[PDB]
């Protein structure tokens, strides 16, 4: 079994700690770290690598990501490079990915995933408890898109379709590595692509619950990620999903108190940013949207406005964006960001303020209404 | 011997009349009194329904108009003090209840529980109810906060609903309050504060009944109550409490889910209203406040700022207000309003968003630190 840690900007100590756990694990035959460039961190892990291999009897390799796709060169190139390495330079039967920066990692993540693979599943995804105001891309972009475009499939039921923590069977990794839609997704869209393509190909999926959760400012920290996750859905929108898929999830535990009691973002800063980086093109682009959204966002030039951006207004908005949004156009990018920000604020003030349980319940029903709306049309 | 009082203004007649019926049917209630603000629609409906309710229940149901007994805005204070005057001068009943006209959860239990605690010996019985984490912002940030910073060694800041209009007094407590000029003059929203304070100051023994079943717009809706409740505390600040008081509270149930999952105010409207109705004198009055507060509120001329207004900034702010605020002055009232608004927003986004239990714990701890800070000094 190969374990992969993609990294770029992470501090060395956290990645090295995780490497040491994975290398020590009885079922792990090799650890690979993949980075962007030979920096301080990359050199540190290269230096520390041989002490770790001798101590564990497990080979630890470092490699650079190669340019395999055609978008911004980010996470997708790293993961796809790991797929090639696993397929062409190893004979291991299974590959795990874990983000380099997870601070809650332990032998349990590896064990649970392997045991699920033993059971027969082609793909094992880890999922985690999350704060009511985390996962706003997952919820408002990815799962929403899946519900609205493929309501009869497993896609919108997957818990963490953006999660980078997962295990694949060799054959699943080969299928993804060979798929050109996946190979080209060199940016933040890679996780969406892996998720979508595995489901479309009827790979069987198990979702393991990891109770400790994943420990790793304004909403604008997420803006590139948001743009690329949305572009990934938009790129897939005319695809057909023609076959069922086995999909099961470990029953989740009660959310831990310290996770239920996190705030996901700085509300003040987010309100402020909503009023910034406006341009006449952004103002003119709003003429594509429904009346309450156009007026709501136009208001945002002067003061934060977001009550208008409820569930149905968001679905209406999502449809216009699927049709008109252009990845790489700066005004479209900023507009998406503002529109999503008003959706996040609306949900924060009218749903998340009512409590964790209330929020979870609203989000699941949101998907249910989106699927039903899409299935009736 | 027991009188039940419902002061009223513009409430819907059916809620009030339902409650009147409940009170008069109660075996322990000898007379029901309704005190009307003026001869409006509500008052006419009450006066029509009265003689029939007296006949159906064999209990006298009287209607009267609030008199002008105080020297401030003619409001709740006049209404309640008029009921005291009547209880004392035109009846011989030994106990008086007050209930708000529009409580929708009213039953004989509210009366029985209060009567039973008086039988036990208490001078004053106050009811208290579960409340949502964004309700009771005057109670917490103004009244309980003031009680904690001004009389930390007393029972005052430990009282759960000092602003609550659901309570029972023994005749001698009522007489003492009616006779007190500080109380007689508080014709506005400050009356509840005055009742709570003077009873404690005079060593009246207090019991708090828990009513499990008991209990919109921008913060704007609470602006008049806010400025009058603050003025009430300000008007008492040099008073001394030189005797203890017996005070016990019924143990509270877990908050009902339907109450934990409410929202208390329109956030968007509140953020907007924070940027309005500036005057250059308000800008200049800010010069009296600490630097982060001065800078923070000044920013509110252009965008909402509130992160600065944590509990320590609020305590510093409260001291400046106690010293400088001018009741009845439009700029001072408006500044208090914005100042409290930033405090409620700060608490909403950094505390209440973390969940009900986190919020409750934070609030009780806040009073704890305010008592400690005040007693040390
Ligand atoms: Na090993
Ligand atoms: Na009676």
UniProtKB/Swiss-Prot annotation, chain B:
Annotated thermal dependence: Optimum temperature is between 85 and 90 degrees Celsius. It is stable at high temperatures, however at 90 degrees Celsius the stability of the enzyme is only moderate and 50% of the activity is lost after 30 minutes incubation. At 65 degrees Celsius, the specific enzymatic activity is 5-fold lower than the maximum value.
Q: Where does (R)-glycerate bind?
A: 131, 136-139
Q: According to the UniProt entry, what is the EC number of this protein?
A: 2.4.1.269
The outcome of changing residue 189 to A is: Results in a 3-fold increase in the catalytic efficiency coupled with a 7-fold decrease in the affinity binding for D-glycerate compared with the wild-type enzyme. It does not influence utilization of GDP-Man
Q: Where are the disulfide bridges?
A: none
Where on this chain does a divalent metal cation bind? 102
Stated consequence of mutating residue 66 to A: Results in an increase in the catalytic efficiency (up to 72-fold) coupled with a decrease in the affinity binding for both D-glycerate and GDP-Man
Q: Which GO terms describe its molecular function?
A: hexosyltransferase activity; identical protein binding; mannosylglycerate synthase activity; metal ion binding
Subunit structure, interactors included: Homotetramer. Dimer of dimers.
What role does it play? Involved in the biosynthesis of the stress protectant 2-O-alpha-D-mannosyl glycerate (MG) which is produced in response to growth at supraoptimal temperature and salinity, and protects several enzymes against inactivation by temperature, freeze-drying and osmotic stress. Catalyzes the condensation of alpha-GDP-D-mannose (GDP-Man) with D-glycerate to produce alpha-mannosyl-D-glycerate. It is specific for GDP-Man, but it can also use alpha-GDP-D-glucose (GDP-Glc), beta-GDP-D-fructose, alpha-UDP-D-mannose and alpha-UDP-D-glucose as sugar donors.
Protein name per its UniProtKB record: Mannosylglycerate synthase
Name its species.
Rhodothermus marinus (Rhodothermus obamensis)
Starting at the broadest rank, the lineage of the source organism is: Bacteria, Pseudomonadati, Rhodothermota, Rhodothermia, Rhodothermales
């Amino acid at each position: 079994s190969l374990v992969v840690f993609p990294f770029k900007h992470e501090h060395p100590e956290v990645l090295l700690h995780n490497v040491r756990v994975a290398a020590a694990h009885p079922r792990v035959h090799e650890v690979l770290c993949i980075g962007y460039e030979r920096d301080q961190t990359y050199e540190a892990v290269e230096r520390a690598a041989p002490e770790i291999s001798r101590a564990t009897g497990t080979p630890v390799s470092v490699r650079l990501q190669e340019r395999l796709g055609t978008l911004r060169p980010g996470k997708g190139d790293g993961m796809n490079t790991a797929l090639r390495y696993f397929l062409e330079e190893t004979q291991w039967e299974r590959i795990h990915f874990y983000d380099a920066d997870i601070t809650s990692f332990g032998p349990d993540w590896i064990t649970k995933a392997e045991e699920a693979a033993d059971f027969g599943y082609g793909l094992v995804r880890h999922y985690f408890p999350r704060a009511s105001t985390d996962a706003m891309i997952t919820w408002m972009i990815t799962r929403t898109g899946f519900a609205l475009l493929w309501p009869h499939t497993e896609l919108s039921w997957i818990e963490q379709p953006l999660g980078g923590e997962l295990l694949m069977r060799r054959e699943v990794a080969a299928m993804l590595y060979e798929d050109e839609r996946v190979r080209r997704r060199s940016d933040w869209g890679i996780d969406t692509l892996y998720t979508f393509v595995t489901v479309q190909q009827g790979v069987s999926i198990y979702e393991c619950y990891i109770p400790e959760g994943k420990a790793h400012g304004g909403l604008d920290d997420l803006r590139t990620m948001l743009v690329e996750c949305f572009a990934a859905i938009q790129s897939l929108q005319h695809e057909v999903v023609g076959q069922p898929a086995i999909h099961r999830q470990e029953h989740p535990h009660r959310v831990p108190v310290h996770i239920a009691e996190r705030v996901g973002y700085d509300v003040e800063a987010t309100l402020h940013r909503l009023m910034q980086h406006w341009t006449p093109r952004q103002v003119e682009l709003l003429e594509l949207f429904t009346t309450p959204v156009r007026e709501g966002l136009r208001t945002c030039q002067r003061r934060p406005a977001f009550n208008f951006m409820d569930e149905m207004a968001w679905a209406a908005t999502y449809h216009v964006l699927l049709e008109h949004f252009q990845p790489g156009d700066p005004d479209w990018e900023e507009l998406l960001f503002k529109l999503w920000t008003t959706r996040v604020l609306n949900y924060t003030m009218t749903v998340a303020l009512r409590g964790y349980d209330y929020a979870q319940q609203y989000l699941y029903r949101m998907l249910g209404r989106y699927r039903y709306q899409a299935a009736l049309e």
